[PDB]
Amino acid sequence: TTTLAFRFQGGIIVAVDSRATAGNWVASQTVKKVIEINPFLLGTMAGGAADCQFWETWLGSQCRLHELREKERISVAAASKILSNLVYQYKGAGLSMGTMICGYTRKEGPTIYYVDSDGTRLKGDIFCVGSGQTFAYGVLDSNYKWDLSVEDALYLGKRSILAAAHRDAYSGGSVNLYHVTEDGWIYHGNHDVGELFWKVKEEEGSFNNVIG
Amino acid sequence: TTIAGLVFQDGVILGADTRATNDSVVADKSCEKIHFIAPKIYCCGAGVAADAEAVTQLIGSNIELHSLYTSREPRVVSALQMLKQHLFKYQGHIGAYLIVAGVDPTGSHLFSIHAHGSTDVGYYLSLGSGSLAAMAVLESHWKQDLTKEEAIKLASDAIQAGIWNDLGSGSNVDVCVMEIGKDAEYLRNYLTPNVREEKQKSYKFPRGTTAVLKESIVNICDIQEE
Amino acid sequence: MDIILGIRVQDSVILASSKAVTRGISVLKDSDDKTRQLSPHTLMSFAGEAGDTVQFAEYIQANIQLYSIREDYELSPQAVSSFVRQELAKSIRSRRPYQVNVLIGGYDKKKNKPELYQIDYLGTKVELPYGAHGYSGFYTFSLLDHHYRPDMTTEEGLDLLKLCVQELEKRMPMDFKGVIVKIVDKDGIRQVDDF
Amino acid sequence: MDIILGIRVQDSVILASSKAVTRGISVLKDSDDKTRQLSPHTLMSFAGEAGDTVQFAEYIQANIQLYSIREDYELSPQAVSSFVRQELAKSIRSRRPYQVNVLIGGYDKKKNKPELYQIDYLGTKVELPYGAHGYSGFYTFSLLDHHYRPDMTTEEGLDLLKLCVQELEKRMPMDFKGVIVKIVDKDGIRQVDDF
Amino acid sequence: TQQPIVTGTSVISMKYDNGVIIAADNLGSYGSLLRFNGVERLIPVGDNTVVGISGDISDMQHIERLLKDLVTENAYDNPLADAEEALEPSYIFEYLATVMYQRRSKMNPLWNAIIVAGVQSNGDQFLRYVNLLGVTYSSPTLATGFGAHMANPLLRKVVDRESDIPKTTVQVAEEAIVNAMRVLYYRDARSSRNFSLAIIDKNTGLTFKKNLQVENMKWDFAKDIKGYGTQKI
Amino acid sequence: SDPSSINGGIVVAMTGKDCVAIACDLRLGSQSLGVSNKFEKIFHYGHVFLGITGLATDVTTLNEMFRYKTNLYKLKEERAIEPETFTQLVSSSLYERRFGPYFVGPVVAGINSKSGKPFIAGFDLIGCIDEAKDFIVSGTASDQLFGMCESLYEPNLEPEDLFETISQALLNAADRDALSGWGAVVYIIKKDEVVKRYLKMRQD
Amino acid sequence: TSIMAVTFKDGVILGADSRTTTGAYIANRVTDKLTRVHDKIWCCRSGSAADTQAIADIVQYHLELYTSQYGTPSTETAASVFKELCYENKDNLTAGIIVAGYDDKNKGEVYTIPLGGSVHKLPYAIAGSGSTFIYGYCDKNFRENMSKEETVDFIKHSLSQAIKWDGSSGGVIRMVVLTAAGVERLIFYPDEYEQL
Amino acid sequence: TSIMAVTFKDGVILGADSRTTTGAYIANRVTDKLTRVHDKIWCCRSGSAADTQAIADIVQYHLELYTSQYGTPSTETAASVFKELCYENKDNLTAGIIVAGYDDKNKGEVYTIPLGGSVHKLPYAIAGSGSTFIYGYCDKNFRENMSKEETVDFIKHSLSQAIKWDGSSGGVIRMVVLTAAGVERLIFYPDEYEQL
Amino acid sequence: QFNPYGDNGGTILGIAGEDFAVLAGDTRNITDYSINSRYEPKVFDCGDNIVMSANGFAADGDALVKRFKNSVKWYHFDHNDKKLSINSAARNIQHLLYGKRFFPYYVHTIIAGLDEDGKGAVYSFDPVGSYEREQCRAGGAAASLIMPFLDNQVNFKNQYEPGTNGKVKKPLKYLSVEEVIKLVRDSFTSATERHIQVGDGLEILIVTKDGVRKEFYELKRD
């Protein structure tokens, strides 16, 4: 599992891999680790597959109830805190979650909140979560600037997950990309690593460690 | 594993299934669990396969050298005594469970040996995870003065009981018949009740289906010479 | 000991090794050289359990130096690494194993090629273009996967190594007090004094 | 959370708190403010188990803010610290205790005096001239024992605090990514943005 | 969570053409001590069902009372209690299976393995197993404990699949059960010679046989067996 | 902690018509971390091929040990060792470490130079021989390989068909195992020519 | 296991059941637990079958070598060799052995060697898991200088009860009679002893 | 502890030793283990003394309240109340109780309730640590419809052997006779029963 | 100590076609090395053109199926006999499973049916209710043996167009029901050879717009 989200001049980039494991058994290569809460909110999933799906789907229901009651879109801060306060109630029971709540609102601008199952809630510009986070961080921190083109930023997020998918045994399958703007989130496709890797190797001239 | 041995009119017979397992997977579908010791002494093995194999080969090797030294046919009690003293020494760490049977100048004999070094004498015995299935059959049908034809039937039936009803045991039935005054006859694949049925499809691929990065010739010979 | 990195470029091998020596609560030293010269063109960096690291390194150093005097000849980096691997592979089934991981950087004067070997405490040897031990690799391999080329100069190798060290200084929890860098090439071994 | 320091000088209390947030392998953040304003002249810094720290701090903040509205009055630093201690002392015999240590720095507007309280997760309260939690005190108390005077200015308090942070940066193994410093005096709470 | 104290061993059973047979020995063991020699472990419910129980005897006696209480309760405001609204094997089983699974799910199991044998209203054979975990299964032969390992192999030689059931008569089926009980007496260290056997037939009804004994035992070969290898006397 | 699944990797061997094939992945890891994508697990001593999965230090050690033993064998016997004899040598050598074993899953493959008979064999870590007519599997994805081989395999395949079958058995098994992959090698072995092929596979 | 040795007027009788169990499974229902270490010195074995067989085989070896050098050993000498093995290897053995023998000088003698490796000379001895149930019966019914027929009945009735109550005991009752007349083997089947 | 209840022609007799131990120390050498839950319904206690006393006191309360409402309870009813407490609280109890009583309709009846909380109606019952040593003796010597004098001898001889072999048992042999005639207490001292 | 869980073995397999779906499972039920039954049905018709199997610990499997069947019944009562769609069934099962998050149903659950466009659908759940819609899924003891085969044969993984070097993948196709059943049968025959817990019989439930049909095939009984 490799998930990442970062803030830049043109909004937020969110990229995730698609692998699920049960130990060394590769359970699936086609898993969805991004939940679309509403047109302006995204949730990334790392940790327990059930724990993330269930509670992030539940979060979406709580975000919907907020906008019915208040006639207004829930803030990223408020949404992240509903989830962080929930997991905190269950603390010690054994829930396993690493997640990022990413969205735009007029009052906040583009915002990212890291939330996890031991009750941590952090606001920030860059986060990587999961077994492959260190690999993603390596690529991301080196080529990160505030003012990338939306095209370059999308590539970096994609490339950072690819780097982790390669090195981390428990990450892989495919890369799902998102871009969050003033107007909402936009899906930028599913990219199979078994095709992307070779494409990137040739065009970029990277991955010289591999027999190609 | 289902291994068994029983005596009949002028001989002793051993039986065994042919499945080797690692946890729940079948490692080997056709393996020989009836080990050789002397020309007329055989050993059914259960427990740890490497251990059962190694201990019989070692005692068999020493039995051969003993036979050469004394200029006599080896006795089943010699194999028995050597096996048990070795197994006892290692305190069950060599996890071999064995049924030893054979013919010698003293007569026909049937023994069982346990990993800790204990031995039994019996007219019919069974060991392994299928022992209870086999022993149920042997207890229902064994009698004194069985003919060879009845004995092979009963032995193979006892092994079959294990094959069908025990998950540990499977595939084919091996038998070895040791009769007084005759050559021992070893009957591998005596029964074959578990042949795989023909497949629905052929999964043979079109050539060039697999993507290849490089090709090369491996030099396996000594010195390509001038 | 914490971070040891290695990178093999066109004409040299560069080994970077952290300076900190921490015993539990306090940082006892911030200038420790976690390396031994085995022969004029072969350098070994090391990390692992306290005491065992230096004892092992110096024991290897003595044996290679003894070989050099006996034969009036420098063993190839490959031969040195195979000797080191066997000692570790012998060690792992001992009463008390050496808990030491090493990188061996050497310039083979016969083949005119730099060579980098990574060997862990079990005796697991691998020849690599770049390598690391412990948690270092988790951060640095993704960078090196991205930026490495086999035809890099020594200066480009050092710039790529700065980027690795900056990433480690950003994201690792422990303060490893910077790195001592050493270059192994045809002319021998030298230390980069400003890094 | 790692290092939280406090020092009470002549006319103010200075709280210094580390910026790093580490989750195991990686440093997730390097600008974290480990403090809450409880009232205009009372600041509480905190460190301990993840999640529990902020949950506790914000729970205290809400209760003190509720008191302030109800009575149209600011509680004294002493009263706030006693409230906080009781909550922790209640906590320690719960099903699941708050693992949180705090420093409460306040300026008492009635007495015209700065006040620093140190309270650990058990509910152990002590008023001090200078205080710390966790391993910080092992390094810093010997400095403060040497250099502290009760009549120090705020600038002298900050210089003494730089010397504490430099010692921590030299001898502690963990990179705590510097400190956010805040001053509590008669005019309220302000952050020193360059440290 | 507990541990079983006084215990009953194998219950064995099989279907035949017109009904079912079930059997179980009359022993209540106290570890290795063969403590109680007169324990009935087959408990009839009406004239169409027999519940055979192994495992903990105190939990068996509890189950026995639940079944006795079930018959009473079924008779309440039920003019057809001895006719169309009488208790079926399938009703008695599902009740027990519910109880067993509920008890394991509260981490306080009834430490038993149960076989419900009977004949339904429409003449169908009923034979189903349930244990302390609430695990249920049906088969032409069923056995608990040592019976599973020794009786089933023998009983499956008579009825190996569903299509063998109409070919098996009550004499052949009873013979197989009685032989299996002898085999268990030879080889199960916590069994006894005395047993009870019940036949539930769709024509002849419930025949309950008490105080049966294992007979025609082969021991004579023992006299010739001497030592453990090399001994000749 | 489990030595046989720290480094990861797989070997599979198959018989065909007058030929054998042996194949392996190229990954060496430290649990989740991938370290090397060039770690070959197949070695050869004359015309006998040995694949070894398991703990990588033992893979290297045993290769060096069997090179040693087969070199001395050749000097004394004045001929290259045959697959059947080598199989017994592997078994002997493993079992002599019965109570401190090498954590490996060796696989022998080769053609007997005199009889021309294709031969494959597998072993557990203490030397129990499994001599198979059809195929042998080994490694962290041995279950996956058993599934692929058991369905894909048919007897008497020609060398260039056998290549496709063994390659697809390896590749699809490796893609369902976290600790296998990162490249693969397939040896096609005939009585007096051996072709080695590197496969293109997904690098995650 | 239920085993006992009983001295009487003409000599001594050893008695045993025939059941060997692995947990609740009866591994062997026709075991011979009465084992010969010399012509007229036998023993009853209880505990680990591997251990008691290994010991008995060593003792037989020692008494065979004793006989080659010094003539027929006493029953006391046999019991001493058993004791030496059991006591010196007490940390690695689970053996409870009764040694019984006939001299012409000493007549019938019985020695019991429990787990610790102590020796105890007794008029009769009982041992094994099933012996616990017959301490009361044997104490009340044993007399010294019984006839052969009385001693056979005493053993038969005793082991019958031991078998009845102990699940670890069962099968046939084997006996071995040791007198001046020689060595006589007896066997008694379930249908005989169960109805007593 | 050695305890037993035995039915006979005229009714039933309960018997017990008098030893209570804390490890190897004898805390009380004159304990009364025969305890009254109703006029002619008594019980023998074994296991935890705290637990068996607590149970017996509750049963006595239940049967007293039963008698106020419904008249004299049967021995079966008493055994059922004992069972209900023992079975429902099996996780927290270590109690082995024998219940014995005399009706005029049913005459002498004996019920045993072992650790699990099962009930078993028997002609006689034995229990406690010392009972293991007399299973053989009691099975061989018990007859149905014995006289009072025969049953007293049977219990006296049985518990004598239990006491002899069991360290946890000892002291005096107490007995309680339950017949139509009434309730008779008997006591037998070491100097009487040891020489049997 | 009392262990509330067990392992009854077995293996199950769901495959989604273009306008159909299959859910297959072996009929063997085991504990340890004993066979409990050679024919104990594991795949159930739950109504509303949905088939379900919960493989693993059979008591938790039966409990779950029983509860889902009841959930279908009460969905009809509460929502005017409305047909429970496969996607709605799936979400309902997630909540059933997650309700026992801290004392799980020790089962791997698969359901099969048709989506609201009439296309074939398979859904697969972990023990605590994480789910995904899939085209292909094996569950249970021999899932490790069967799944790589299905990746290769159903989804055409690692298979390339011959002569393209390795740059045009084999293109994805829907399989016919006859083709799917051949792959199902060969999967279980293969699994039966190498896994000791798989055998005895194979029962396949096929779901189309016309309803639920059954097919049974013998497997090796060793």
Ligand SMILES: *[C@@H](CS(C)(=O)=O)[C@H](Cc1ccc(CN)cc1)NC(=O)[C@H](CO)NC(=O)[C@H](CC(C)C)NC(=O)[C@H](Cc1ccccc1)N=[N+]=[N-]
């Ligand atoms: C990677 C997280 S990691 C390796 O960095 O910890 C993924 C992230 C992820 C996957 C899937 C989804 C949504 N479907 C969202 C995020 N997480 C996983 O791979 C986890 C790692 O533990 N995998 C699981 O939770 C698996 C998923 C199944 C599909 C295989 N499930 C299990 O491991 C449970 C464990 C369990 C639970 C209860 C009882 C018994 C066993 N099932 N199993 N086995």
Ligand SMILES: *[C@@H](CS(C)(=O)=O)[C@H](Cc1ccc(CN)cc1)NC(=O)[C@H](CO)NC(=O)[C@H](CC(C)C)NC(=O)[C@H](Cc1ccccc1)N=[N+]=[N-]
């Ligand atoms: C049945 C014995 S049983 C189930 O009743 O205990 C067979 C008997 C047998 C098989 C093969 C041979 C060959 N000469 C002789 C006798 N035994 C087995 O199937 C054993 C059961 O443990 N199988 C093994 O020992 C397998 C053999 C395969 C590798 C070929 N080995 C493993 O499973 C190893 C061994 C192991 C050994 C001792 C203790 C634990 C594990 N495990 N691994 N890896």
Ligand SMILES: [Mg+2]
């Ligand atoms: Mg990977």
Ligand SMILES: [Mg+2]
């Ligand atoms: Mg992989």
Ligand SMILES: [Mg+2]
């Ligand atoms: Mg008995």
Ligand SMILES: [Mg+2]
């Ligand atoms: Mg099978």
